Design an enzyme around this catalytic site. Structure first.
Site, short mmCIF file in Angstrom:
data_model
loop_
_atom_site.label_atom_id
_atom_site.label_comp_id
_atom_site.label_asym_id
_atom_site.label_seq_id
_atom_site.Cartn_x
_atom_site.Cartn_y
_atom_site.Cartn_z
N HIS A 89 99.05 -68.35 156.00
CA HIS A 89 98.12 -69.78 156.05
C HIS A 89 96.54 -69.71 155.81
O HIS A 89 95.92 -70.67 155.57
CB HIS A 89 98.07 -70.69 156.79
CG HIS A 89 98.02 -72.15 156.83
ND1 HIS A 89 98.61 -72.64 155.81
CD2 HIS A 89 97.53 -72.73 157.84
CE1 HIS A 89 98.15 -73.81 156.11
NE2 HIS A 89 97.06 -74.13 156.98
N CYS A 91 95.60 -70.42 166.21
CA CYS A 91 96.61 -70.00 165.20
C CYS A 91 96.74 -68.91 164.83
O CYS A 91 94.87 -67.72 164.91
CB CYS A 91 95.90 -70.87 164.07
SG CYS A 91 97.64 -69.87 162.38
N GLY A 137 92.98 -73.63 166.64
CA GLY A 137 91.92 -72.45 166.05
C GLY A 137 92.90 -71.80 167.10
O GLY A 137 92.79 -70.57 166.90
C1 LIG Z 1 96.17 -78.17 169.37
O1 LIG Z 1 97.19 -78.28 168.78
C2 LIG Z 1 97.92 -77.11 167.51
C3 LIG Z 1 98.20 -75.96 168.77
N1 LIG Z 1 98.33 -75.14 167.42
C4 LIG Z 1 98.19 -74.70 166.16
C5 LIG Z 1 97.33 -75.52 166.20
N2 LIG Z 1 96.15 -75.57 164.61
C6 LIG Z 1 95.68 -74.81 164.51
O2 LIG Z 1 95.13 -74.45 165.10
N3 LIG Z 1 96.09 -74.98 162.67
C7 LIG Z 1 95.93 -75.96 161.77
N4 LIG Z 1 95.48 -74.97 160.78
C8 LIG Z 1 94.42 -75.05 160.43
C9 LIG Z 1 93.36 -75.53 160.50
C10 LIG Z 1 91.92 -74.89 159.59
C11 LIG Z 1 90.78 -75.12 159.63
N5 LIG Z 1 90.16 -74.16 159.42
C12 LIG Z 1 88.43 -74.38 158.72
N6 LIG Z 1 90.98 -73.28 160.21
C13 LIG Z 1 92.26 -73.30 159.61
C14 LIG Z 1 92.97 -72.85 160.30
C15 LIG Z 1 94.47 -73.02 160.26
CL1 LIG Z 1 95.62 -72.06 160.84
N7 LIG Z 1 96.98 -76.18 161.61
C16 LIG Z 1 97.99 -76.86 161.29
C17 LIG Z 1 99.01 -75.67 160.21
C18 LIG Z 1 98.34 -74.45 160.89
C19 LIG Z 1 99.87 -73.43 160.09
CL2 LIG Z 1 99.88 -71.89 160.56
C20 LIG Z 1 100.76 -73.95 159.08
F1 LIG Z 1 100.89 -73.21 158.34
C21 LIG Z 1 100.32 -74.98 158.84
C22 LIG Z 1 99.95 -76.60 159.23
O3 LIG Z 1 99.85 -77.71 159.49
C23 LIG Z 1 101.51 -78.29 159.81
C24 LIG Z 1 102.20 -78.30 159.98
C25 LIG Z 1 103.06 -78.40 160.51
C26 LIG Z 1 103.04 -79.09 161.24
F2 LIG Z 1 103.99 -80.47 161.95
C27 LIG Z 1 101.66 -80.31 160.90
C28 LIG Z 1 100.70 -80.00 160.78
C29 LIG Z 1 97.87 -76.53 163.76
O4 LIG Z 1 98.71 -76.71 163.85
C30 LIG Z 1 96.99 -77.55 166.13
#
Ligand SMILES: COc1cncc(-n2c(=O)[nH]/c(=N\c3cc4cn(C)nc4cc3Cl)n(Cc3cc(Cl)c(F)cc3Oc3ccc(F)cc3)c2=O)c1
Ligand SMILES: COc1cncc(-n2c(=O)[nH]/c(=N\c3cc4cn(C)nc4cc3Cl)n(Cc3cc(Cl)c(F)cc3Oc3ccc(F)cc3)c2=O)c1
EC number: 3.4.19.12
Lengths: 305, 305
Positions: free
Chosen positions: B41, B145, B143
């Site tokens: 991603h 991730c 963050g």
């Molecule tokens: C606090 O709660 C959290 C707990 N754990 C993780 C998260 N968390 C993130 O930290 N970052 C996410 N996106 C990013 C945004 C960014 C902006 N920058 C500058 N860099 C970035 C790197 C990433 Cl990865 N995302 C969503 C997500 C990540 C990935 Cl891998 C993906 F394949 C799809 C996706 O979209 C979705 C998917 C399913 C869903 F139900 C909702 C959204 C996410 O959920 C939040």
């Protein structure tokens, strides 16, 4: 999102655990710079444990009576000295993995991370709280003596606990890194009992705020309470009194959620009088009191639901 | 004595967390030998996240588009490749702190330790379980991730989880280190829901055995049950069925305590039908299902009370 008992990463502390042996008594030690800290109980033989005179047993020992093993590398002791209940063994090698550290004493209600260790090799890490009666409800087995508790603050390891003994009730007691015990306990293999314990009120409220930030609100109410009327209810349920200063520390959580501290107290009072009725808060059917306000900020988003 | 959610020491894994950046997207990576693993991603721009074609976006990227930072030391990427949902970045330096490791996929009901990481620097460690619906109830913020889950077995780190995303219900989803997701989820910023969850029966019984070993027995009874009659009660309460093989794994705990597995099932059935009535088991008012039989042996004495 989510809320869980979280420990600090133990890497910086793992590189300091060593095994200390005196005769046939063996336990864990903490190697920082060229000094090794461990419980002085290590110098007791089996028959000395029931009623020792430590400064009488220490004069009878020499440097070469202490075997210090860091992994498989043997360390040579070049000096010894006693500081309250902690033995300080001066070695010839300064630990190359020595992190920035301080020695701090924590207050009742504060939390720390514990690195359970056996024979000088760590086996687990978990989060603990210092109870108001100065015991901790840890998870320790035989040989865990010498294990250390700590907090981590921007690269700096604040050591705050050295495990010594288990009590008849199954709780654990120890000292700070200066050798001064937490609570009215001593280093003698006699049966000692802990005083009656209380619930850390401020921690409960912080945990309730954590719930609100994570989307839960069923326990909230519209009622309000004064500080004293709450204290009269808390005393009847074995809760620690709430000080006006204890309220101030909860300020940041109150502002980020928009719930007055005394309003959150109103919910706590009602929860104390009606229970939870099979309902849960953050996956728990009990009121949790082992999360401080700082732990709640450390984990929860800066933005509420 | 004592029982607590215990994580493995995270030291061996801390020395492998790095920060990976592609354009303005940034997340955590795992540096083992001369390869860096992270979620694919990271190669998505904000507008690509809603519906990406990853192998169309990867052909459009070159090595010098990937910034890998281990602390303050920048690593140079000499090759890239995609393995399912995991991006593999070949770097010029082999990580000197690389431990012995394997890549393993865990089953529903198993546990692992999670190292929460932000911008490549770890912030906490805690114990988690893989739910029967293939989500985990972790504690993760924006963050996180790229964070990884793991077990430790005699110096060898078994990596088993790489965190990807949070779900609308507040649970978390990810993949194994091969890039294969746990459960029916994908890497697209669309709303996906988890299936209905169940209670891990075998884990509950293991937790009950842990209680007995630690001195608690009020929930025990003299009644006995057959495997099927229990399953008919468990289904009504959303518990996973108990297999005759699930009973065998509980053998060691049954022998060390002298309580037949089906006798412990009898207690579970009664607990399901009458609740706990304000009483607690190991300090919990709920039936805990996040301790495996192995976790119980790892922590409890080999000798019962
Ligand atoms: C606090 O709660 C959290 C707990 N754990 C993780 C998260 N968390 C993130 O930290 N970052 C996410 N996106 C990013 C945004 C960014 C902006 N920058 C500058 N860099 C970035 C790197 C990433 Cl990865 N995302 C969503 C997500 C990540 C990935 Cl891998 C993906 F394949 C799809 C996706 O979209 C979705 C998917 C399913 C869903 F139900 C909702 C959204 C996410 O959920 C939040
Ligand atoms: C599983 O439950 C546990 C959880 N955590 C720790 C323990 N645990 C130990 O592991 N080892 C203990 N003694 C040792 C025995 C040894 C034999 N060898 C070869 N080497 C040894 C090193 C030590 Cl230290 N002790 C008792 C204890 C240790 C210290 Cl420091 C002390 F100052 C007095 C004392 O006696 C007491 C004191 C109070 C009391 F209520 C009961 C006994 C202890 O409690 C057990």
């Amino acid at each position: 999102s989510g809320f869980r008992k979280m420990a600090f990463p133990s890497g910086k502390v793992e590189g300091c655990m060593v095994q200390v042996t005196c005769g046939t008594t063996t336990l864990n030690g903490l190697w920082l710079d060229d000094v090794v800290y461990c419980p002085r109980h290590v110098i007791c033989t089996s028959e000395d444990m029931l009623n020792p005179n430590y400064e009488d047993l220490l004069i009878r020992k020499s440097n070469h009576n202490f075997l210090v093993q860091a992994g498989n590398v043997q360390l040579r002791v070049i000096g010894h000295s006693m500081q309250n209940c902690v033995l300080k063994l001066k070695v010839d090698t300064a630990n190359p993995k020595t992190p920035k550290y301080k020695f701090v004493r924590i207050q009742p209600g504060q939390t720390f991370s514990v690195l359970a260790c056996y024979n000088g090799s760590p086996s687990g890490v978990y989060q603990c709280a210092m109870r108001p009666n100065f015991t901790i409800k840890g998870s320790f087995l035989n040989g865990s003596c010498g294990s250390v508790g700590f907090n981590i603050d921007y690269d700096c390891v604040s050591f705050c606990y050295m495990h010594h003994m288990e009590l008849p009730t199954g709780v654990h007691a120890g000292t700070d890194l200066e050798g001064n015990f937490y609570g009215p306990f001593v280093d003698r293999q006699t049966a000692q009992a802990a005083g009656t314990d209380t619930t850390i009120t401020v921690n409960v409220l912080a945990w309730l705020y954590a719930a609100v930030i994570n989307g839960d609100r069923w326990f909230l109410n519209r009622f309000t309470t004064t500080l004293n009327d709450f204290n009269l209810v808390a005393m009847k349920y074995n809760y620690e009194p709430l000080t006006q200063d204890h309220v101030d520390i909860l300020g940041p959580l109150s502002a980020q959620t928009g719930i007055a501290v005394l309003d959150m107290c109103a919910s706590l009072k009602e929860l104390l009088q009606n229970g939870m009725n099979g309902r849960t808060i953050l996956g728990s059917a009990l009121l949790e009191d082992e999360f401080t306000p700082f732990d709640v900020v450390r984990q929860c988003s800066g933005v509420t639901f």
